[PDB]
Design a protein around this ligand. Sequence first.
Ligand code: A1B2Q
Ligand code: ZN
Length: 140
Amino acid sequence: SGAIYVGNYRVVNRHLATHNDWANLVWEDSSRDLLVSSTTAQGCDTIARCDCQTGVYYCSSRRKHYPVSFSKPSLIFVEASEYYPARYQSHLMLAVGHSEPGDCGGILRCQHGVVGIVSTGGNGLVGFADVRDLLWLDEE
Ligand SMILES: CSc1ccccc1CN1C[C@H](C(N)=O)CCC1=O
Ligand SMILES: [Zn+2]
């Protein structure tokens, strides 16, 4: 689990969104495994606006923060899971690292801010849903 709090927005994995998130829905995309809902209180996170390929991510199944190199956001085939059938997931970035289903929500961050959140894993790889193209998160 995990979320990003920026301005009056809450960014979570679409598969982990609550009844309140759907009731206060701003934007969602099943093909990205992302959902944004509105909040009453102001958040303190800053979204990165960059093309960085190195950062650090939190892995809850290891209680550790790992430095990693990661790929550019792309359309990647993702095997069937408890929450989605087999499909292509868009805006996804991979790194060599550990990831288990309950690790979804873990933040990936570079020197500029939050880059994305853990969304996929398996085979010694970890995948992150990019949020750097969602420019509207910085305004209104
Ligand atoms: C070894 S499977 C694994 C590992 C780490 C994380 C996630 C998974 C499988 N998964 C992928 C889904 C998706 N984004 O398409 C989201 C929910 C889920 O459980
Ligand atoms: Zn950056």
